[PDB]
Amino acid sequence: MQEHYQPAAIEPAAQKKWDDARISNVSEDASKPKYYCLSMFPYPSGKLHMGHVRNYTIGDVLSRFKLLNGFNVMQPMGWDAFGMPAENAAMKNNVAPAAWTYDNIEYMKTQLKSLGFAVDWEREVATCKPEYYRWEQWLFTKLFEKGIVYRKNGTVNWDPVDQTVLANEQVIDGRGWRSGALIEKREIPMYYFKITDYAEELLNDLDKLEHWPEQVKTMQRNWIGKSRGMTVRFAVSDDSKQGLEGDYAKFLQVYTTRPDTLMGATYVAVAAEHPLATAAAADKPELQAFIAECKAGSVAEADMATMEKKGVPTGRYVVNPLNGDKLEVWIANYVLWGYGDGAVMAVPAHDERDFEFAAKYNLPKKQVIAVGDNAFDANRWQEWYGDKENGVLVNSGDLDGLDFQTAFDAVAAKLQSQGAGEPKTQYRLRDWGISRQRYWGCPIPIVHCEKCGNVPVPADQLPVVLPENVVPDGMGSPLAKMPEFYETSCPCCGGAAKRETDTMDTFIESSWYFFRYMSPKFSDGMVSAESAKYWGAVDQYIGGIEHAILHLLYARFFTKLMRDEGLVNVDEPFERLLTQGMVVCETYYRENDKGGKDWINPADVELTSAVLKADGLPVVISGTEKMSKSKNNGVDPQELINAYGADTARLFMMFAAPPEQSLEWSDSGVEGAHRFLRRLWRTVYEYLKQGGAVKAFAGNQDGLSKELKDLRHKLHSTTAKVSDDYGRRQQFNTAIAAVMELLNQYDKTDTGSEQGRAVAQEVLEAAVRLLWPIVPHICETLWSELNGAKLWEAGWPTVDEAALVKSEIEVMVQVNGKLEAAALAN
Ligand SMILES: CC(C)C[C@H](N)C(=O)NS(=O)(=O)OC[C@H]1O[C@@H](CCn2nnc(-c3ccccc3)n2)[C@H](O)[C@@H]1O
Numbered sequence: 129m130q131e132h133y134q135p136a137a138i139e140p141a142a143q144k145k146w147d148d149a150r151i152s153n154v155s156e157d158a159s160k161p162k163y164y165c166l167s168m169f170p171y172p173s174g175k176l177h178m179g180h181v182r183n184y185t186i187g188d189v190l191s192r193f194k195l196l197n198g199f200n201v202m203q204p205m206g207w208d209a210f211g212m213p214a215e216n217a218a219m220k221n222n223v224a225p226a227a228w229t230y231d232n233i234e235y236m237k238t239q240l241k242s243l244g245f246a247v248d249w250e251r252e253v254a255t256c257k258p259e260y261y262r263w264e265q266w267l268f269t270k271l272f273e274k275g276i277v278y279r280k281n282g283t284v285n286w287d288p289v290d291q292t293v294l295a296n297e298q299v300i301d302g303r304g305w306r307s308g309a310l311i312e313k314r315e316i317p318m319y320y321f322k323i324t325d326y327a328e329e330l331l332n333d334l335d336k337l338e339h340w341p342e343q344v345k346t347m348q349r350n351w352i353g354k355s356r357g358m359t360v361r362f363a364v365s366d367d368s369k370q371g372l373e374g375d376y377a378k379f380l381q382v383y384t385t386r387p388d389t390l391m392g393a394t395y396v397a398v399a400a401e402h403p404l405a406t407a408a409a410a411d412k413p414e415l416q417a418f419i420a421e422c423k424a425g426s427v428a429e430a431d432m433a434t435m436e437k438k439g440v441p442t443g444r445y446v447v448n449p450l451n452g453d454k455l456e457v458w459i460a461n462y463v464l465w466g467y468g469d470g471a472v473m474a475v476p477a478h479d480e481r482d483f484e485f486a487a488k489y490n491l492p493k494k495q496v497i498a499v500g501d502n503a504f505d506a507n508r509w510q511e512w513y514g515d516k517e518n519g520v521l522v523n524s525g526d527l528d529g530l531d532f533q534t535a536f537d538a539v540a541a542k543l544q545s546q547g548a549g550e551p552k553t554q555y556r557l558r559d560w561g562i563s564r565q566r567y568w569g570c571p572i573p574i575v576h577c578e579k580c581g582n583v584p585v586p587a588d589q590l591p592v593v594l595p596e597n598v599v600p601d602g603m604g605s606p607l608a609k610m611p612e613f614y615e616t617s618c619p620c621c622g623g624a625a626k627r628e629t630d631t632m633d634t635f636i637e638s639s640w641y642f643f644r645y646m647s648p649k650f651s652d653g654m655v656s657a658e659s660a661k662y663w664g665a666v667d668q669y670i671g672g673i674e675h676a677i678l679h680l681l682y683a684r685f686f687t688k689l690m691r692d693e694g695l696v697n698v699d700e701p702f703e704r705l706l707t708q709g710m711v712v713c714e715t716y717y718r719e720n721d722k723g724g725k726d727w728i729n730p731a732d733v734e735l736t737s738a739v740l741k742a743d744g745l746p747v748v749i750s751g752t753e754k755m756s757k758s759k760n761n762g763v764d765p766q767e768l769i770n771a772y773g774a775d776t777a778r779l780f781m782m783f784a785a786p787p788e789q790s791l792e793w794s795d796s797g798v799e800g801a802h803r804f805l806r807r808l809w810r811t812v813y814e815y816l817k818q819g820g821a822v823k824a825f826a827g828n829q830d831g832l833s834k835e836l837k838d839l840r841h842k843l844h845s846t847t848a849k850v851s852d853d854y855g856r857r858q859q860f861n862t863a864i865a866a867v868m869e870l871l872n873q874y875d876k877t878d879t880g881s882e883q884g885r886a887v888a889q890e891v892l893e894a895a896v897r898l899l900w901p902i903v904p905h906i907c908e909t910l911w912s913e914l915n916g917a918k919l920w921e922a923g924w925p926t927v928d929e930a931a932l933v934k935s936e937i938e939v940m941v942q943v944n945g946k947l948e949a950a951a952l953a954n
Pocket residue numbers: 168169170171173177178179180183208638670671672673674675679755756757762
């Protein structure tokens with residue numbers, strides 16, 4: 129055994145040892161209990177980042193821990209390969225997106241393997257291969273004929289200079305983020321998943337996820353946004369019917385979740401596209417300008433509640449069906465056409481948004497709820513204004529004194545008797561638009577025929593292969609300019625036809641890849657019935673918080689779709705969910721000629737102040753934030769691996785912070801991780817240099833010295849703490865510190881005697897197995913010097929209960945014939 133720890137010597141050897149043994153190449157074996165640990169598969173962007181290493185080390189810690197506990201562990205990895213990055217790099221470098229993608233996949237795969245992740249590489253998938261995306265095309269056609277996928281006109285943001293569609297997030301003050309040109313609102317046909325048909329299922333099944341963080345479930349419930357409210361129809365006043373036709377000339381219909389406050393409505397608001405807005409704006413230019421600005425907006429959903437709420441009066445009036453109050457109709461920008469009736473009522477006294485809106489325009493506020501003897505101030509919002517649990521109605525005629533639920537039913541009774549309303553359930557959830565005007569994506573398996581219509585491609589003809597011999601030029605979507613691709617014959621009548629040229633939302637590939645891992649070479653379905661029955665669902669899912677809403681919802685949606693098709697047997701894809709924190713780093717900048725700042729990468733800086741590691745001039749040390757190319761502060765994990773080895777990288781990330789907490793890059797912290805790995809190496813080397821390995825202590829410890837009994841107690845309490853940290857709390861930093869405390873007590877214990885050597889062997893054999901999930905290379909190597917058995921067959925260390933019992937000293941007491949501090953307690 130070499131005296132000094134050298135990762136480059138031992139890390140490749142241990143990896144070949146694991147690969148030769150095929151410990152991570154698992155099958156559907158009915159003898160061993162299964163464990164499916166999955167980390168969110170990455171985009172092949174080019175090279176691993178520090179967040180990748182943290183995500184996939186966490187998965188490897190939990191996977192190796194369950195492996196040592198005798199589980200049949202599947203930890204698969206693949207490549208979420210489609211998307212815009214390969215298209216931009218194609219436009220920048222004059223390379224095909226597929227070639228750029230497959231080169232990145234190969235390099236990053238090398239990086240993942242060099243980190244020693246226990247991964248079943250025989251189950252690797254790449255979502256840009258026809259062998260993969262043919263099966264989401266298949267599900268597309270199957271759901272298309274059922275109507276779960278449907279085609280409909282929708283509005284997109286067209287950039288006329290970049291000749292491409294932009295999402296709301298890419299529109300800055302009505303202009304494209306890169307082109308700077310005014311974007312145009314265009315109505316084009318697109319395809320949608322009818323996800324609202326599954327809204328109640330997706331909402332209620334969240335209750336089954338006892339091992340999900342409550343914030344993720346709460347974020348999903350809010351996104352679905354189920355409400356049990358009331359449709360209410362306000363009759364249009366006789367003086368306000370000019371320009372209206374149909375039911376819009378008769379009444380204004382609204383949806384409210386607070387029909388108990390209907391007696392407090394002081395005005396109503398309609399969307400810009402509402403017929404009342406159109407009729408009132410017919411001769412009022414300010415209204416036309418207000419309507420035009422609302423239509424031209426591109427507020428993203430994450431920013432919808434933070435935009436300033438503005439409105440204009442219409443001069444039109446409607447009648448409250450309960451009290452007869454005549455309320456003026458306003459056009460408001462927060463009322464969205466397509467949500468409900470595109471019209472709301474406003475109760476400023478008990479809805480905070482209505483309170484600020486009314487305070488802005490000096491609109492009336494009528495208190496109709498009371499909570500105890502609290503004072504109501506019309507000029508200052510108080511939180512109890514919106515209380516639904518502990519309020520009684522006031523100023524509401526015969527509704528006074530009622531609570532929320534009894535007033536709800538009474539108002540429903542009054543409105544239904546008049547025919548002016550009825551209870552109604554609504555959802556904020558919109559249908560899922562999957563059409564993308566992009567090239568590097570899964571082709572939509574639809575053929576357009578002027579005789580047969582939009583026709584799904586038959587199953588025999590799938591996949592619709594995306595041609596990889598393409599270099600996008602930025603003058604529109606390439607597929608739309610490739611007659612060799614879209615010109616085809618109709619599969620129904622054989623006539624002249626054209627393929628769909630839009631590609632799928634790349635969220636689709638990541639909505640079912642966890643099932644494909646179960647049988648990634650199955651050629652007769654999305655996933656084989658045998659593999660799905662065995663692996664069931666994912667036991668542990670690890671990923672970033674940025675996917676807590678859309679990705680998880682889409683994955684749960686696809687799981688229920690595939691279940692209804694009879695392909696899988698589970699209602700939920702992910703049992704346990706672990707969301708790991710971001711990785712932050714210091715930033716460095718230099719002031720600019722033009723009054724700006726030039727951000728410098730940390731690796732090109734040396735501390736002392738701070739100066740460049742190649743030049744000699746000083747730079748400015750700035751704030752710490754998430755590693756990104758924005759402020760040029762991304763630390764390359766490859767340089768960390770090259771400088772210290774994979775175990776140091778894995779150890780630092782697990783020790784620096786709990787997995788959910790933000791991890792700050794620390795040069796001294798990395799050195800501390802490497803120094804501990806050297807200490808662990810020296811501890812084993814020095815132990816073996818003083819007499820070699822012996823049989824580890826086991827059995828009755830009566831007769832052991834007090835010092836060695838205390839070391840066994842610390843040992844088996846460390847094992848219990850570490851097991852509870854890996855399995856239950858999932859806090860790996862405290863598990864490392866516990867092993868460090870065990871090594872500290874070992875260092876202070878004399879283990880020179882025959883029984884001392886036996887206890888020392890027991891300590892080190894457990895310590896290397898307790899740390900094997902975190903730093904497997906050095907633990908695999910150190911274990912082989914201590915014991916001949918295979919580490920993974922020796923299994924996770926067991927807790928000796930007898931090592932935790934303390935020896936009593938039952939003594940008798942007598943005063944005047946019928947430890948001295950214990951008798952003082954007596
Ligand atoms: C399941 C699907 C939807 C996952 C999807 N393919 C994805 O997010 N793929 S991904 O590759 O973006 O991330 C995969 C997982 O790794 C963690 C950290 C990733 N990361 N850290 N830093 C960086 C980075 C920073 C600057 C520039 C470039 C990269 N990216 C994420 O939270 C995910 O859980």
